[PDB]
């Protein structure tokens, strides 16, 4: 179903393709299996760490798709790993055994597909997490309009600052992960404008509060400047969301 992945997932899943191509051959192509107790112990250690980290994410996540789609993959990896462990124990008796062989093939296949499914499910939840932050900043930008005091401006700026920092970090990490260079350009340029307009917003709000209280002219020019900055910043954040949605959109709709 998914054609493109991030530069990270493509690199992690690059060797996996050839691994599966070899594992799928085994059923068609003497015996003597060399021990395999130590390499299987490493898989169990690796699998348990992945399932642990995975289960921590499912427990701490806000995402219902993740909470639903991730746990079946742990089971798929755990069942396949117990097959590798079961296989290693019957090879202790005699390395020349056909039932132990089938358990090794289905074990490795079941782990590889399971971890690739787990990774894709996780990255899909991550892009959703980035879209939620962006939308959150959008909503908080609409609040600038009610700020009419120095106390509220401090409150506002101290609430907006971390969100802007969280979003900027997310977008820098994300753009560096994309394979479409023109998509990266759209995200960097949009995030550049937001980063550049953020002190402009504060300056405009500061002029508005100082003119409001106190007193009179020019509240219209200050208002105009604040509203424009919010509108331009909002249009750019929406540009970021839309680029991220072009890529990530899944069924239905």
């Amino acid at each position: 179903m998914p054609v493109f992945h991030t530069r990270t997932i493509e690199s992690i899943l690059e060797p996996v393709a050839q691994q599966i191509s070899h594992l799928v051959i085994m059923h068609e192509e003497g015996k003597a299996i060399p021990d395999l107790t130590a390499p299987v112990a490493a898989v169990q250690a690796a699998v348990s760490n992945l399932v642990r980290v995975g289960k921590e994410t499912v427990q701490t996540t806000e995402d219902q798709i993740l909470k639903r789609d991730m746990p079946p993959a742990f089971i798929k990896v755990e069942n396949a790993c117990t097959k590798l462990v079961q296989a290693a124990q019957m090879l202790q008796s005699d390395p020349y055994s056909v039932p132990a062989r089938d358990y090794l093939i289905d074990g490795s296949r079941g782990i590889l597909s399971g971890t690739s499914d787990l990774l894709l499910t996780f990255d899909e939840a991550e892009v959703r997490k980035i879209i939620r932050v962006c939308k959150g900043i959008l909503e908080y930008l609409t609040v600038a309009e009610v700020v009419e005091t120095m106390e509220d401006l401090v409150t506002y700026t101290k609430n907006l600052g971390p969100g802007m920092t969280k979003m900027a970090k997310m977008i820098d990490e994300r753009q560096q992960e994309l394979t479409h260079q023109e998509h990266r350009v759209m995200l960097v340029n949009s995030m550049n404008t937001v980063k550049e307009l953020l002190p402009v917003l504060i300056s405009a709000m500061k002029i508005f509060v100082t003119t409001k209280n106190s007193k009179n002219q020019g509240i219209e020019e200050a208002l105009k400047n604040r509203n424009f900055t919010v509108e331009k910043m909002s249009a750019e954040i929406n540009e970021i969301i839309r680029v991220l949605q072009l890529t990530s959109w899944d069924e239905d709709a």
């Binding site: 990270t8 594992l23 299996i33 060399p34 490493a42 898989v43 992945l50 782990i111 990774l119």
Partner: peptide
């Protein structure tokens, strides 16, 4: 990158089990 690194170590641990089947 904890899940990504944990997944990477799993794929790496399965590699010696493959070459053992392939002889």
């Amino acid at each position: 990158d904890d899940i990504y690194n944990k997944a990477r170590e799993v794929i790496n641990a399965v590699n010696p089990v493959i070459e053992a089947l392939e002889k």
